[PDB]
Symmetry: C5
Subunit: 265 residues, 5 copies
C-alpha cells in the first residue's frame, strides 16, 4: 500500500553515483575487473575469465529518522536515473584484418543491459543447448532447460559469477526493479554505442511510483558486451588467430540514481 | 454487439494475468514440442516437423464474473493493455565458429517476431510461397495451394501447436477481436537485434476506447520468435560441409502481462 | 470548391476493405515472377507491375470522402522456399532491391515514365513503355496507372500531379540487401490535407494502387547466389496488400 | 528589421513548384541533365560528365504592387520536397560472384536547400596533393579543412561538384539546407518519398526565407550510389571502368510563400 | 548558488560562432598513415579539437547551441577496391563527439590493453587502467594532444559541461553523416540552468572520425596497401553558442 511522497526538502532527497566496472567473473565473492577477458576460445565451453558476467553494486542509503509512525513507514524511492556507457573507438588496440587490408576494430555479438531495483535482479537460467554447451563450474550453471518454463532454474544476481550468456532477467518477477537489455547477434556485426550527460530515464510506474528501497539499499546491475577483438598489432579475423579472439566490454557503466522519500502502509 | 460503459474500477473489477509462451517446433497438433532450437532444418525443399518453427499458443482462463447477465446485457473482461517481452541471451560458444573470419559465428539469418492477443484464436491465411516446389510434412498444418492472399486462399484459426510460421500469415480481413504485430527480416546472414525490458507497454484499445472483449472467459495469446539460425557449440559453421547442422534459433520464451477491466455489452 | 462534411450518421459513413494481389503483368496474380534473368531486357511475367483496384462505393453534389486508411503487407519468413548458399553453408533467404508503395485516390495514379538507361535497357512490347527520358523533365512521358502492365522499374509517382491521391514509397537498393517487413492491425494513416479534406471520390469509386517487391529468391531446396543458378533468380513480391478505407460524405 | 506578415488573402499568398534535374555539369552556363554520368573511373581525377554537381533553380516571384512605404517581400515559410526514383534491377548489371543482380550501391549524398540567394559553399579538397579536378569544374583550391582560408563561393552555376563543395554554416543566413552523406563502396541506398510530408522553413522568431531579390533559389543533389551497365557484369575488377554514378531522376519542390513587411 | 536571469535586452544576450578544425596533434582532415602496428603515433591518431572563445566583459550563461559536421562524399579521393570492382569510399570505426562547457572537458584515461597497446610520448598517455575505476587517470582536455582512442568524457565530473558522443566499431562499417542549419540543441538542466561561463569564456571540444581511407586513384582494402590506410576526419565542426546573463 503506497501513500504520498514526503514533501521535498534538502533532507528528503538523496542522489548517489556509481561506476560499475566490467566483470569477467572467476569467483562468487570477488569480481575480476577488466574490460577485455581471457581469449574466449572456439570451444564448446564457457571459461572463467573469458565469459562476461553481470556487474553488480549494492549502495546503502541513509537512515531516515522517525521512519515508522502509526501504521506507516517512510522509505527511499528511486524515481529517476541517468546511465551512460564509458567507451572509446578501438583502432590500434584491436588488431588488423589482412583480407580487407585494414584495422579489424570491434565486431560481433553484443549485449547492453542495465537494471536498478530494491533487491538483487531476478534471473532465469537457460542453457541454449543443454546437450552440448558446457559451463566451467566456477560460473553459475544455468541447469538443463533451454526454455523459460516454470521448471527453469531461477536465482538472483547477488554474486560476481553469473554469465550473461546463461542468465536472463526474469519478467515474471523483478516487480521492484526496472531493467532494459539489447542483444545483437552475428560474428562480424558492427557495434554502435552512444553516450552523453543530458539523457535521463524515469523509473516510475503507471501510478507514479518508483523503486521502493524497503531493504535500505539500491541495487544496480549491468552488462555491456561491445563485441570481440583481436590483440594490438597482430592479425585477427582469420583462422590462425581465432585462439586470440577476446570479448570486449565497456570500460564501465555510470549510474546516477535520484531518490525521494515515500510513505507506505 | 453494442459496447456500453466500463464498470467502475475497483479491486474486483480489474485483473491482470501473466504467461510465458514457450517455443514450439510442432510435431503434432495437441502436444507442443517446447525447445528453443529445432532439429537441423536441412537444405532441402521440405519443411519437417521438429525443424520448422510453429506458432506458440496459450489460452488463459480469466476469473468468473458473478451476476454478469441482465436481460440483453452482460459484463465481460476487457483486455485494454499488455506488456510483452522476448527472453533471449547473446549466443557465443553456443553457436559455433566460422573459419573464414576466424571468429564466433553467432546467430544470423531470417527472422520473425510476432505476437497476438485476442478473445479467441488468431485468424490466419495459408500461403505456400511456391505451391509446385515447396513441400510440407503431413504432421504440419498444410496451407493449401495459393501463393497469394486471395479470397480463395485457405483460412484457419491457430488452435493447435503445428502451424508453421513459414506457411500461415495473420489475416487482416478478420481478427476483429485480436490485436497483432509482426516483423520479418530476410537474408541468410542478417544479424538479429532483440530488445527487452519491463517498462514498455502496448495499448489494445481501438479508436472508440474498446479493448479485446474476452467474451468466452479466456484470453488467447499467440507468438512466434525466430531469431535466426545457428550452428552447434564448439564446431565449424557457415561453410558448405556443415550446412546439414544449421538449426533454427528461437526465443527462449515470450512473456505477456495482460491487463483487464470489466465492460458491459448489449 | 469543397464545402462542409455531411453530418455523421450510419448512412453517411462507409468503409471498405480490399486485398490487392501481386501482379507480374503480361498485358493491359502470382507472388513470384518468372525468372528475371541477368540480361538487359525486362520481360512480361518477370517484372513486377503495379497492382490496381477500383472499388465501387455506394450511390448517394455530395461525394464520398476517404479520410483515413489502414494498410498492411502480407508476408511470411522465407526459409526452405528460397534455397541455400553454399559459400556460407546456410539458407539464402530473400535479399536484394526492394520497393514498398501504396496509393489511395479518387482516380488512377499519375506517373512519370523513366528509362534509367535509354540506350541500353530494353523493355518487352507487352509492358507499358516509359519513353526515352532518364530524367523527370517536362518531356518525360506522363500516364495514369489504369491497367495491369505498368512496371515499377519504369514508372514513378508524379509529384506535380496526384492532387487527389495520397501515396508513399520506399526503395532499397543493392543485390544482397536484407529486407525488413512489418505488419499489424493497429496502425492507421490519415488522408486529410492542411484544410481537413481527404480524397474526394468524384467518380463514385476509390482507386487503390500498390507494389511490394521484397527482393529476389532462388527456388526451394536448391543452390542459389552463385553464377550457375543466376538464370533461376526470381522476384519475390508480397502475398498481398490489405487496405481498409474509411469514407464520409462531403458536399462539393 | 522583420515586422508583421501581411494579412492573408488570395493575393498575399503564392506557391510554386519545380523539378530540379540531375546535373553532371560539363560547363558553367548550361547543365548536363542526365541521371547517370559518364564512367567515373578508378582514377585520381574527377572527370567532367562523371562527377555529380549541384542542381540549381532560380524561380522569379510575382511583383507585389505598392510594395514600398518599410517594404513588402515574399517570405517562403514551408516547402515540400521529394526525390523521384525507381528500383534499379535489369538496369544495373549483375554480380557474377553472387549470381544475382548488382543493384545500386555505394557512397551517397542527399541534399536540398532553399534560400533568398545562391547557396554559400566552402571549397575543400580532401587530399590537395593527390586528388585532381578537371578544369571545366569549379576547383576548390588547396585547403583540406574548413578554415577561414578555405575558398568560399556561391553555387551560381552548373559545374560545382558535390565531392568538393560543402554548404557553409558560417553563412547561409537566408537559406535553409539539409544534407546526408553515406560512405562505403557497397552500401545499400534507402530512398523514401510521398506526397504527405512537409518541411517548415521558419526560424526561432517565426520568420522564413525572405526573398528580397524577387526570386527563390533552390539547390539540390541526390547521388543514390553507383551502378554498372544493363546486362553486363559489375562489382568485379574487370568491369570497374564502367562503374557510373547513379543520381535521382529529379527532385520535386513545392514552395509556399506569403507576404512579410520589413524595415 | 544560481539566482535569476538578467532581463533580456540587446546588451544581455550574445552569440558566437566557431569552426573547430580536425587535429592529429596541427590541422588536417586526413592523418599520416595510421599503420597496422601496436602503437599510436603523433599525426596518425585523431586527438580532440578544442577552442576557448572569450566572451564580452553576473556571468554569461550558454543555454542553446547549434553544431554541424562539415563533410562531403568521398569518391575518387578514397581509392578503389579490386575485390568489388568499385570505389572503396570511407569505412571503418567512427567517433562523433561534441562538448560545450564553462571550463575544459573532464576526461578519464583508459588504455584498452595496458600490456600491449603503446602510446608515443608526444601524446597524452592515459596511464595503466583498462577500466573506469577511481584509480583511472583523470585529466582535463586543455591541450591539442589528447588521443580520442585513449580519453573518454568523465560522467562523474563535467557538472558545467554538456557533451554527446557516438562510437561505431568494425573495420568496414559505412559511415552516415547528416548536417543542416535548422537543428538546435538546448543546454539547460532540469532547473532551467545552462552552462555558466564563470571564466568569461566558453569552452568547445569536438572529435569527428568518419572512418578510414585509401589514397586517391590507388588500390586499398587489400593487404599490400594496409600501410597507406589513413584516418578520415570531418572537415570541421561548426558551433553557434547562444548566451544570456545570469546572476550567480
Amino acid at each position: 500500500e503506497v501513500l504520498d511522497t514526503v514533501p521535498l526538502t534538502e533532507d528528503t532527497q538523496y542522489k548517489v553515483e556509481a561506476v560499475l566496472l566490467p566483470n569477467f567473473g572467476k569467483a562468487a565473492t570477488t569480481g575480476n575487473f577488466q574490460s577485455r577477458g581471457l581469449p574466449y576460445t572456439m570451444s564448446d565451453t564457457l571459461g572463467p575469465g573469458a565469459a562476461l558476467c553481470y556487474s553488480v553494486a549494492v549502495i546503502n542509503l541513509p537512515e531516515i529518522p522517525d521512519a515508522m509512525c502509526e501504521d506507516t513507514m517512510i522509505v527511499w524511492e528511486a524515481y529517476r536515473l541517468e546511465t551512460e556507457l564509458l567507451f572509446a573507438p578501438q583502432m590500434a588496440s584491436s588488431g588488423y584484418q589482412r583480407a580487407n587490408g585494414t584495422l579489424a576494430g570491434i565486431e560481433g555479438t553484443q549485449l547492453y543491459f542495465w537494471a536498478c531495483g530494491g533487491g538483487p535482479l531476478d534471473v532465469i537460467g537457460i542453457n541454449p543447448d543443454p546437450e552440448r554447451l558446457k559451463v566451467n563450474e566456477a560460473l553459475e550453471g544455468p541447469g538443463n532447460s533451454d526454455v523459460a518454463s516454470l521448471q527453469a532454474l531461477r536465482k538472483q544476481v547477488n554474486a560476481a559469477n553469473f554469465p550473461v550468456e546463461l542468465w536472463v532477467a526474469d519478467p515474471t518477477k523483478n516487480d521492484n526493479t526496472r531493467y532494459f537489455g539489447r542483444v545483437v547477434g552475428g560474428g562480424v556485426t558492427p557495434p554502435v554505442v552512444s553516450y552523453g550527460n543530458q539523457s535521463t530515464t524515469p523509473l516510475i510506474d503507471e501510478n507514479g511510483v518508483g523503486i521502493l528501497c524497503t531493504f535500505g539499499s539500491v541495487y544496480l546491475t549491468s552488462a555491456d558486451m561491445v563485441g570481440m577483438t583481436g590483440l594490438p598489432g597482430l592479425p585477427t579475423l582469420s583462422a590462425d588467430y581465432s585462439n586470440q579472439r577476446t570479448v570486449q566490454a565497456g570500460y564501465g557503466r555510470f549510474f546516477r540514481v535520484h531518490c525521494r522519500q515515500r510513505r507506505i502502509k
